[PDB]
Design an enzyme around this catalytic site. Structure first.
Site, PDB file in Angstrom:
ATOM      1  N   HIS A  56       4.472   2.177 -13.114  1.00 45.86           N
ATOM      2  CA  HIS A  56       3.221   1.602 -12.583  1.00 45.86           C
ATOM      3  C   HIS A  56       2.056   2.586 -12.648  1.00 45.86           C
ATOM      4  CE1 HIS A  56       6.072  -1.270 -11.200  1.00 45.86           C
ATOM      5  NE2 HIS A  56       5.293  -1.855 -10.306  1.00 45.86           N
ATOM      6  N   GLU A 140       3.064  -7.498 -11.200  1.00 45.04           N
ATOM      7  CA  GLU A 140       2.948  -8.547 -10.191  1.00 45.04           C
ATOM      8  C   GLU A 140       1.520  -8.989  -9.887  1.00 45.04           C
ATOM      9  OE1 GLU A 140       5.205  -7.297  -6.782  1.00 45.04           O
ATOM     10  OE2 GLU A 140       7.119  -7.760  -7.748  1.00 45.04           O
ATOM     11  N   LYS A 222      14.795 -11.085  -7.682  1.00 47.25           N
ATOM     12  CA  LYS A 222      15.687 -10.236  -6.864  1.00 47.25           C
ATOM     13  C   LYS A 222      16.708 -11.051  -6.068  1.00 47.25           C
ATOM     14  CE  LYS A 222      12.334  -6.598  -6.992  1.00 47.25           C
ATOM     15  NZ  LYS A 222      12.313  -5.121  -6.808  1.00 47.25           N
ATOM     16  N   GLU A 257      12.540  -6.190 -13.006  1.00 46.56           N
ATOM     17  CA  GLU A 257      12.876  -5.814 -11.631  1.00 46.56           C
ATOM     18  C   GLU A 257      13.987  -6.730 -11.097  1.00 46.56           C
ATOM     19  OE1 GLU A 257       9.570  -5.388  -8.941  1.00 46.56           O
ATOM     20  OE2 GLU A 257       8.511  -3.992 -10.254  1.00 46.56           O
ATOM     21  N   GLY A 263      12.533  -4.092  -1.624  1.00 44.76           N
ATOM     22  CA  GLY A 263      12.261  -2.989  -0.700  1.00 44.76           C
ATOM     23  C   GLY A 263      13.091  -1.772  -1.055  1.00 44.76           C
ATOM     24  N   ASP A 307      14.759  -1.469 -10.952  1.00 46.50           N
ATOM     25  CA  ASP A 307      13.636  -0.626 -10.556  1.00 46.50           C
ATOM     26  C   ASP A 307      14.087   0.470  -9.578  1.00 46.50           C
ATOM     27  OD1 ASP A 307      10.887  -0.928 -11.606  1.00 46.50           O
ATOM     28  OD2 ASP A 307      10.315  -0.785  -9.478  1.00 46.50           O
ATOM     29  N   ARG A 321      16.882   3.090  -2.787  1.00 48.28           N
ATOM     30  CA  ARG A 321      17.171   2.540  -4.118  1.00 48.28           C
ATOM     31  C   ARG A 321      16.784   3.498  -5.243  1.00 48.28           C
ATOM     32  NH1 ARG A 321      13.485  -1.461  -6.397  1.00 48.28           N
ATOM     33  NH2 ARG A 321      13.947  -2.993  -4.752  1.00 48.28           N
ATOM     34  N   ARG A 446      28.607  13.860   3.797  1.00 49.64           N
ATOM     35  CA  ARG A 446      28.943  13.520   5.175  1.00 49.64           C
ATOM     36  C   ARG A 446      30.168  14.261   5.720  1.00 49.64           C
ATOM     37  NH1 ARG A 446      26.484   9.455   7.390  1.00 49.64           N
ATOM     38  NH2 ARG A 446      24.683   8.500   6.330  1.00 49.64           N
TER      39      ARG A 446
HETATM   40  O1  LIG Z   1      11.040  -4.118  -4.460  1.00 46.05           O
HETATM   41  C1  LIG Z   1      10.333  -3.119  -4.203  1.00 46.05           C
HETATM   42  O2  LIG Z   1      10.658  -2.247  -3.375  1.00 46.05           O
HETATM   43  C2  LIG Z   1       9.022  -2.942  -4.915  1.00 46.05           C
HETATM   44  N1  LIG Z   1       8.282  -4.186  -5.019  1.00 46.05           N
HETATM   45  C3  LIG Z   1       6.945  -4.148  -5.577  1.00 46.05           C
HETATM   46  C4  LIG Z   1       6.917  -3.451  -6.943  1.00 46.05           C
HETATM   47  O3  LIG Z   1       6.642  -4.436  -7.952  1.00 46.05           O
HETATM   48  C5  LIG Z   1       8.198  -2.704  -7.367  1.00 46.05           C
HETATM   49  O4  LIG Z   1       7.833  -1.566  -8.157  1.00 46.05           O
HETATM   50  C6  LIG Z   1       9.203  -2.265  -6.287  1.00 46.05           C
HETATM   51  O5  LIG Z   1      10.530  -2.456  -6.817  1.00 46.05           O
END
Ligand SMILES: O=C(O)[C@@H]1NC[C@H](O)[C@@H](O)[C@@H]1O
Ligand SMILES: *[C@@H]1O[C@H](CO)[C@@H](O[C@@H]2O[C@H](CO)[C@@H](O[C@@H]3O[C@H](CO[C@H]4O[C@H](CO)[C@@H](O)[C@H](O)[C@@H]4O)[C@@H](O)[C@H](O[C@H]4O[C@H](CO)[C@@H](O)[C@H](O)[C@@H]4O)[C@@H]3O)[C@H](O)[C@H]2NC(C)=O)[C@H](O)[C@H]1NC(C)=O
Ligand SMILES: *[C@@H]1O[C@H](CO)[C@@H](O[C@@H]2O[C@H](CO)[C@@H](O)[C@H](O)[C@H]2NC(C)=O)[C@H](O)[C@H]1NC(C)=O
Ligand SMILES: *[C@@H]1O[C@H](CO)[C@@H](O)[C@H](O)[C@H]1NC(C)=O
EC number: 3.2.1.76
Length: 595
Positions: A56, A140, A222, A257, A263, A307, A321, A446
């Site tokens: 991005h 987006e 997603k 994605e 998130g 992503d 993530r 851990r």
């Molecule tokens: O799902 C997300 O955390 C984010 N959503 C918004 C963005 O399009 C993306 O870069 C991220 O993966």
């Protein structure tokens, strides 16, 4: 009652394409040492296992009529050095210049900018390289992801045309797709639906011509913790586009994605371990088997991207993530960063061992046939020998996964029945296995009691849990048949690898680099492109001070961290490949190291 997995190595069905070799992130920077190590880890996934880094805000790395392409030059050069290409989102305000895309003058400027950079990097890397890049629209567009840039529906179309005409002005061979959004039922997603209508039927801002080039349709879908939900959502959207835009019936669809959960920063204990690693493979399996394997309906699905190239931040080094785990070790002189290879990223190298053809495979439990829409599944591949470099291969990736739920208290009995292996010289097999017990760097972290600033030894121990448990190359029983009865855990992953001995030994390791970490600690990274075979056991690393081998446990990942007991790291390093038949390849060129 056990799960039965059957593989017919003689029945090479259809082409199997490595459609999942992509990652991404959003900056909050990209030139920082942290980020430099990150992409060294990504590029280290063997056999080109991750190709594209969908980035991005790439046009905020450019200032302002002429432009300073210094920052963009640096990031792209960085990508290039790690054998990666950018998912080039034409996204950014060129450090604040562009503000309104209904401003006729600004639309022209944007075209000239896009032409400008495109031509720049054709000159920098070659048209043969740049043509592979997936140029894309602003991420987006329906999510208002714009900063101070004003982008109405009409503006998005002007924006698009300028992107298209500008790229063409550089060269017609350059590809462009969009919108990179979700495509919810109308009146939702107006800009995403509006784009297709425009590309299909509207007129071109610059040429007045009806119809505007659109090479692929990218979307974001997603799973909300469900693996199959992703696939289900893709079918619905894809069919809506087949019927509404009949010109785009053959236009490839990407999902760049395709994550289990929206998130990235949200901490999840499954994101830390093999739970994520298994579920990622389940998605790829579900996609290949239940969509791309001649299931008479075949939508053109070309790309799946996770992503997950973000860098983690404290106090959540594993739970986010991300492909790697970051540790900002703030108590040394000076403060230095360290990254760890999460299970997911290790698994991207397991997937990478698959080849150009899918074999016939069936998963059943006591008579009942189970497809990849179940806790267990399989992807099997075979390879047609290219040169004297390689020979025949079979890659059998079995997965056990209950999505975002793990089950430590359960064991899953599996019987693998492999048949129909074409006869040939010196046939051997090699198992590779990953679970939360034996291969969780988060697990080890851990056990060591969650140290915030890990020591050298703690870092050594945590690293020992990165690579999967492997077994020495055993010869295949006669008849070209293999039967194993592994007890798999939930989650786990199991890759059985059958290889015939090629004529000549492996190729020469190339592009070797030493990267400083801290006092008496560094990263060694290389490239396997000239190795020309996948039937590898490990990489021999030798060290010179005046060459003797660094005694390490086997690993085929193209990245090693040298953290020796003596603290002695200054000298020279050479690296070579070792195959399943003990054969050495040529040593890379020696690389000196000054500390
Ligand atoms: O799902 C997300 O955390 C984010 N959503 C918004 C963005 O399009 C993306 O870069 C991220 O993966
Ligand atoms: C070792 O030293 C390094 C720096 O040298 C420290 O690194 C910092 O770590 C903190 C982690 O707590 C980072 O701050 C966090 O940033 C998160 C996101 O950053 C960007 O993204 C968001 C939105 O995407 C923007 O709003 C923001 O402006 C940033 O651009 C935030 O999400 C975090 O806030 C959340 O957690 C805090 C609690 O920590 C809550 O108070 C908030 O409400 C919110 O839920 C947080 O602000 C920081 O970016 C790091 N800096 C650098 C340079 O890396 C380490 O902290 C240090 N190690 C130790 C052990 O102290
Ligand atoms: C994957 O499997 C699940 C079953 O677990 C399917 O979900 C079911 O779909 C039917 C539609 O005929 C619904 O009536 C059921 O309520 C669903 N079951 C559950 C438990 O939710 C799902 O459709 C399958 N998907 C694919 C693509 O095969
Ligand atoms: C562009 O910006 C960089 C980094 O800020 C700076 O060092 C360089 O001098 C600039 N280049 C030109 C040609 O202005």
């Amino acid at each position: 009652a056990p799960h039965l997995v059957q593989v017919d190595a003689a029945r090479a069905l259809w082409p199997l394409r490595r459609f999942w070799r992509s990652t991404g992130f959003c900056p909050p920077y990209v030139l920082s040492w942290d980020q430099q190590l990150n992409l060294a880890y990504v590029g280290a996934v063997p056999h080109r296992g991750i190709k594209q880094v969908r980035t991005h805000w790439l046009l905020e790395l450019v200032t302002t009529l002429s432009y300073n392409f210094t920052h963009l030059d640096g990031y792209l050069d960085l990508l290039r050095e790690n054998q990666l290409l950018p998912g080039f989102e034409l996204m950014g305000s060129a450090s604040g210049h562009f503000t309104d895309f209904e401003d006729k003058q600004q639309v022209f400027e944007w075209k000239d900018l896009v032409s400008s950079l495109a031509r720049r990097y054709i000159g920098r890397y070659g048209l043969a390289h740049v043509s592979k890049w997936n140029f894309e629209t602003w991420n987006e567009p329906d999510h208002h992801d714009f900063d101070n840039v004003s982008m109405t529906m009409q503006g998005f179309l002007n924006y698009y045309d300028a992107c298209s005409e500008g790229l063409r002005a550089a060269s017609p061979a350059l590809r462009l797709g969009g919108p990179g959004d979700s495509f919810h039922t109308p009146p939702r997603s107006p800009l995403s639906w509006g784009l297709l209508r425009h590309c299909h039927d509207g007129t071109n801002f610059f040429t007045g011509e009806a119809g505007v080039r659109l090479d692929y349709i990218s979307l974001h879908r997603k799973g909300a913790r469900s693996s199959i939900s992703i696939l289900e959502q893709e079918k619905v959207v894809a069919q809506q586009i087949r019927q509404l835009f009949p010109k785009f019936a053959d236009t490839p669809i990407y999902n760049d994605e395709a994550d289990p959960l929206v998130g990235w920063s949200l901490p999840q204990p499954w994101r830390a371990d093999v739970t994520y690693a298994a579920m990622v493979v389940k998605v790829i399996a579900q996609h290949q088997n239940l969509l791309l394997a001649n299931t008479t309906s075949a939508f053109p699905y070309a790309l799946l991207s996770n992503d997950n190239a973000f860098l983690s931040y404290h106090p959540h080094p594993f739970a986010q993530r991300t492909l790697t785990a970051r540790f900002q070790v703030n108590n040394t002189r000076p403060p230095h960063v360290q990254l760890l290879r999460k299970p997911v990223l290790t698994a991207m190298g397991l997937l990478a061992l698959l080849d150009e053809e899918q074999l016939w495979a069936e998963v059943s439990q006591a008579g009942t046939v189970l497809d990849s829409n179940h806790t267990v599944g399989v992807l099997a591949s075979a390879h047609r020998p290219q040169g004297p470099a390689d020979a025949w291969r079979a890659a059998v990736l079995i997965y056990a996964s209950d999505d975002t739920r793990a089950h430590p208290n359960r064991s899953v009995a599996v019987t693998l029945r492999l048949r129909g292996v074409p006869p040939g010289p010196g046939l051997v097999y090699v198992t590779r296995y990953l679970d939360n017990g034996l291969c969780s760097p988060d697990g080890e972290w851990r056990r060591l009691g969650r140290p915030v600033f890990p020591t050298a030894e703690q870092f050594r121990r945590m690293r020992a849990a990165e690579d999967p448990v492997a077994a020495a190359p055993r010869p295949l029983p006669a008849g070209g048949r293999l039967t194993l009865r592994p007890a798999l855990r939930l989650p786990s992953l199991l890759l059985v690898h059958v290889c015939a001995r090629p004529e000549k030994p492996p190729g020469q390791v190339t592009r070797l680099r030493a990267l400083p970490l801290t006092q008496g600690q560094l990263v060694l990274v290389w490239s396997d492109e000239h190795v020309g075979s996948k039937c590898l056991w490990t990489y021999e690393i030798q060290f010179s001070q005046d060459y003797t081998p660094v005694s390490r446990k086997p690993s085929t990942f193209n990245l090693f961290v040298f953290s020796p007991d003596t603290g002695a790291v200054s000298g020279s390093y050479r690296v070579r490949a070792l195959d399943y038949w003990a054969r050495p390849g040529p040593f890379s060129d020696p690389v000196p190291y000054l500390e």
